[PDB]
């Protein structure tokens, strides 16, 4: 229920090396399935998940041509931005493209995205209506005028409303064995004494998919919005994810702390406590 | 599949 598709482009200029580096990655939800690198010996789109490998040669050849044209155009766009900001030809710069579509459990489109950043900072975004541009500064407005004259918004909208949703539903069908299954987190609590009167309680959620998860700690019955250290979700490396949350606790009151885990694969929201061995 | 565009800014 409710899926998404995303393409991420990164272009880094290399003034000591002529042409820039272009990398593209494609994701269905939290599963990457394609990749492209302009630095390869023979740059082509490559598969990164099994359920995409069944596509025929025309798919790969067409997408490879797409990426090559995109890389050239991004080189020219980086030179354009350098001009816009009156920056020098010595430094290296980064242009990032983000586009994709979020659909619902039915299949209909819920939201589209098509935005761009320059040197890590927001540059220009296609608004939610898919017909208007929000620009960040004056150079972004130069680009906005260029794009309004070329009716770029309509092309973005044609992709987001049409090809994006169709191919996303195709991907969900051909990969439904994994893309629709929600791997629940294997959860456990753990206890390390820091000294003699304090202890750290760590709540562990491992091996879950998708990445979205909520971990909270609660003393007696009240949460810890200031005592709960949270590491950000990290990839296990097998397409599943991990997270933990820890609390400092006075020694001798380790049963007044409950850990609440909420995940899409959990039949109901779950609650654990230190099961001391 | 990626979008069959090469937008320039």
């Amino acid at each position, epitope marked *: 229920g409710s899926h998404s598709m995303r393409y991420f482009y990164t272009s880094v200029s290399r003034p000591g090396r002529g042409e820039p580096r272009f990398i593209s990655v494609g994701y269905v939800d939290d599963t990457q399935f394609v990749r492209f690198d302009s630095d390869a010996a023979s740059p082509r789109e490559e598969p990164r998940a099994p359920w995409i490998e069944q596509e025929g040669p025309e798919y790969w050849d067409r997408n490879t041509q797409i990426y090559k*044209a995109q890389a050239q*155009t991004d080189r*020219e766009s980086l030179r354009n931005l350098r001009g816009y900001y009156n920056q020098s030809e010595a430094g290296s710069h980064t242009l990032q493209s983000m586009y994709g579509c979020d659909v619902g459990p039915d299949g209909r489109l819920l939201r589209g995205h098509n935005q761009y950043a320059y040197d890590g900072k927001d540059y220009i975004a296609l608004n939610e209506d898919l017909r208007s541009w929000t620009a960040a500064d004056t150079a972004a407005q130069i680009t906005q005028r260029k794009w309004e004259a070329a009716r*770029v918004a309509e*092309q973005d909208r*044609a992709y987001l409303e*049409g*090809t994006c949703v169709e191919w996303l539903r195709r991907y969900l069908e051909n990969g439904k064995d994994t893309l629709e299954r929600a791997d629940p987190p294997k959860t456990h609590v753990t206890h390390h004494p820091i000294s003699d009167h304090e202890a750290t309680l760590r709540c562990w959620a491992l091996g879950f998919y998708p990445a979205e998860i909520t971990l909270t700690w609660q003393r007696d019955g009240e949460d810890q919005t200031q005592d709960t250290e949270l590491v950000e979700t990290r990839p296990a490396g097998d397409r599943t994810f991990q997270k933990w949350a820890a609390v400092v606790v006075p020694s001798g009151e380790e049963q007044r702390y409950t850990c609440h885990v909420q995940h899409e694969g959990l039949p109901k929201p779950l609650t654990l406590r230190w099961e001391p061995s | 599949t990626p979008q*069959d*565009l090469n937008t320039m800014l």
Partner: T-cell receptor
Amino acid sequence: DAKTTQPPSMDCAEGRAANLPCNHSTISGNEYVYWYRQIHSQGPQYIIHGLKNNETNEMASLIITEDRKSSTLILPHATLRDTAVYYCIVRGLNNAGNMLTFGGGTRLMVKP
Amino acid sequence: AGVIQSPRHEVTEMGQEVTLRCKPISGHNSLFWYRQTMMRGLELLIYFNNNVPIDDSGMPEDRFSAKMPNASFSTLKIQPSEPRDSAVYFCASSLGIDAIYFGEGSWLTVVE
């Protein structure tokens, strides 16, 4: 790539209305219908384009059916100048279908 | 001001270099080279978008080279020219998804 069908030839009386049909059964939602004409091998000339709703301008009218599977170019009062080849071309909104691919066209003779 | 093409006429012996030049409508980002003979009707040679070659499958495999160094200049070069290259080469340009506009054409006759 070429996606349209037209009658190879068609006559019309000068001063009368010329109805040039076109079939594009396989058209897609985000594809436009364009109409060009060519006179004496000169450069093809844009006439009109449309998406779904009827369109009219200072050269012709474009009538697209409800199911968008066929259309008609209407010259109102055809003159002798309008004797030419008329191409009905589908044009998409991405790089794959951004270019015009010319089919047979309809060779329109305006006879006085 | 429309699309500007040069030369308008060229009659030259075979075996030498032919260069056709095109200035698109200023502000346009898309450029097309088409060719017209009697046999084939109107064929796309090359499609540039933002000076990047997007589609060149219509390019002959040898002696034909298309080039866009900037958004206001494009060349098509034939070397060496052969009689089978005789045709009318049209340059067209477009702003975004607006209508594509054609130049007046370059009529090349390569004589044996």
